[PDB]
């Protein structure tokens, strides 16, 4: 059974009063440095520092020049040469902005997606490799050191509708993506082709790889849109509108993830994490760094947490986190690197701080 | 088990990332 417990220590509301769709703690900050997180919503990116006694200290605010931009996602990285932190943000305009989080100014931008960007993810080993997933049915891999588009994952056997989410595995060898077409697709980036394309992007009109075929595809996990996917080791966690996060794997029970053939037609369900009132799309789940906790907010302000070290997903459920004043949809949550703080962000521009007891 | 084997892969792989992070000194925002 789960033993994790949390106390709500603070909340605030951003004055724009627009929904907050993303929240990310900076996991690159070194041990001892202040815990910082970014929120995104409206045409804004806001940074906060966590201090003792629940204090949430406003650091800086970035307001996009375009008043009609609606940011949907953000992700942290660092400059591999100077160790300086960096933040990537994107949304409805389909433009990626690289922001200097110390000065809160935009450094540069990437255009190319034909529609909105639903998620940004940085590679876990190479801080220059940025993955964007879009309403244009494709994923794109960028090298932000050389400003090149490494690869476009889409086409003949790519997604047939808007891509909602994607995740690199722990070592950054492969990506699982999911979207409106109900499918979950695997894209290996440790192939000889992709490793060479990444190397060529460092040597650099650069020619992008056009990856038309995924290494695995399934529409047999969910019966509707798949709006969130994360790797859990070699297994996958994904959700649709069934009020459940499904833990599954490509192939049969004993099939090795690295021996799965691209035409593999089987999938194996290992378990389900059940919850309530979260059957509308655009609701993300998150995990802590060590992947010992899983968190998901619902449409009425409840925050569910599960202990991933408890095998049975029913016994894994922690006490649901609720506050009588937190009644709006929790779009995304983020744990600090050490798992001591869990922040939730809402449709009513509110931010909620929960400290682990 | 499938669970214990998967947890061990997560433990080993997150430990590799944690050691890479420990070796870094990213400037505070
Ligand atoms: C409240 N009101 C303004 C209605 C409303 C308007 C726009 C969205 C809306 C929210 N997020 C993304 N993408 C980002 C995304 C993708 C997958 C899961 C996920 C997110 C954000 C949180 O979980 N969106 C892309 N297109 N629309 C949207 C949602 C609701
Ligand atoms: Cl991030
Ligand atoms: Cl191809």
Task: Describe the protein in words.
- The complex is a heterodimer of chains A (357) and B (29).
- Chain A has one domain (1-357).
- Chain A contains one helix and 28 strands.
- Chain A has a five-stranded mixed beta sheet with strand order 10-11-12-13-17, covered by helices on one side. A four-stranded antiparallel beta sheet of chain A has the order 1-28-27-26, with no helix packed on it.
- Chain A has 357 residues and is mainly β.
- The longest helix of chain B has 21 residues, at 2-22.
- The chains are: A mainly beta (357), B mainly alpha (29).
- Chain A binds chain B through residues 26-31, 33-34, 36, 47, 49, 59, 78, 82-85, 101-102, 124-125, 170-171, 232-235, 253, 270, 289-291, 309, 311, and chain B through 1-3, 6-7, 9-10, 13-14, 16-18, 20-22, 24-29.
- The complex binds the ligand CN(C)Cc1ccc(-c2cnc(NCc3cccc4c3CCO4)n3cnnc23)cc1 and chloride ion (2 copies).
- The site of one chloride ion (CL) has 3 residues of chain A, from loops.
How many E strands of chain A? 28
The total tally of domains of chain B equals 1
| Order of secondary-structure elements of chain A | EEEEEEEEEEEEEEEEHEEEEEEEEEEEE
Using the alpha-carbon principal axes, give the shape of chain A. Answer: globular
Count of individual domains of chain A = 1
Number of helices of chain A: 1
Quaternary structure classification: heterodimer
* Helix-strand sequence of chain B: H
How many helices of chain B in DSSP terms?
A: 1
Count of DSSP E strands of chain B?
0
- What is the strand content of chain A? over 45%
What spatial form of chain B do the alpha-carbon principal axes imply? rod-shaped
**Straight-line N-to-C gap of chain B:** 43 Å
User: What's the helical proportion of residues of chain B?
Assistant: over 70%
| Category by helix and strand content of chain B | mainly alpha
Structural class estimated from helices and strands of chain A: mainly beta
Helix content of chain A: under 10%
Bound molecules: the ligand CN(C)Cc1ccc(-c2cnc(NCc3cccc4c3CCO4)n3cnnc23)cc1, chloride ion
The largest chain-to-chain contact, stated as pair and per-chain residue counts, equals: A-B, 34 and 21 residues
């Amino acid at each position: 059974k789960c033993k994790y417990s949390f106390k709500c220590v603070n909340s605030l509301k951003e004055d724009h009063n627009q929904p907050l769709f993303g929240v990310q703690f900076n996991w690159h900050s070194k041990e001892g440095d202040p815990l910082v997180f970014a929120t995104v919503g409206s045409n804004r990116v806001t940074l906060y520092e966590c201090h003792s006694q629940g204090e949430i200290r406003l650091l800086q605010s970035y307001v996009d020049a375009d008043a009609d931009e609606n940011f949907y996602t953000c992700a942290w990285t660092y400059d591999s040469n100077t160790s300086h932190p960096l933040l990537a943000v994107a949304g409805s305009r389909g433009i990626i902005r690289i922001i200097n989080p110390i000065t809160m100014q935009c450094i540069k931008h990437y255009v190319g997606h034909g529609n909105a960007i639903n998620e940004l993810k940085f590679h876990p080993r190479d801080p220059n490799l940025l993955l964007s997933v879009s309403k244009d049915h494709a994923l794109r891999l960028w090298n932000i050191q050389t400003d090149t588009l490494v690869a476009i994952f889409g086409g003949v056997e790519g997604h047939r509708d808007e891509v909602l989410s994607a995740d690199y595995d722990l070592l950054g060898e492969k990506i699982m993506s999911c979207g409106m077409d109900h499918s979950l697709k695997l894209w290996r980036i440790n192939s000889k082709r992709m490793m060479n394309a990444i190397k060529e992007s460092y040597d650099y009109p650069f020619i992008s790889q056009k990856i038309h075929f995924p290494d695995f595809s399934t529409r047999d996990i969910h019966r509707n849109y798949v709006d969130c996917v994360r790797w859990l080791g070699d297994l996958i966690l994904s959700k649709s509108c069934e009020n459940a996060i499904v833990c599954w794997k490509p192939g049969k029970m004993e099939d090795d993830i690295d021996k799965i053939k691209p035409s593999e037609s089987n999938v194996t369900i290992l378990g389900r994490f059940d919850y309530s009132q979260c059957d509308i799309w655009y609701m993300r789940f998150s995990m802590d760094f060590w992947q010992k906790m899983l968190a998901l907010g619902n449409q009425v302000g409840k925050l569910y947490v599960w202990d991933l070290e408890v095998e049975d997903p029913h016994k894994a459920k922690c006490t649901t986190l609720t506050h009588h004043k937190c009644g709006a949809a929790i779009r995304q949550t983020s744990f600090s690197r050490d798992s001591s703080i869990l922040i939730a962000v809402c449709d009513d521009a509110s931010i909620w701080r929960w400290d682990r007891l | 088990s499938m669970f214990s084997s998967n947890r061990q892969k997560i433990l080993e792989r997150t430990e590799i990332l944690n050691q890479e992070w420990k070796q870094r000194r990213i400037q505070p925002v």
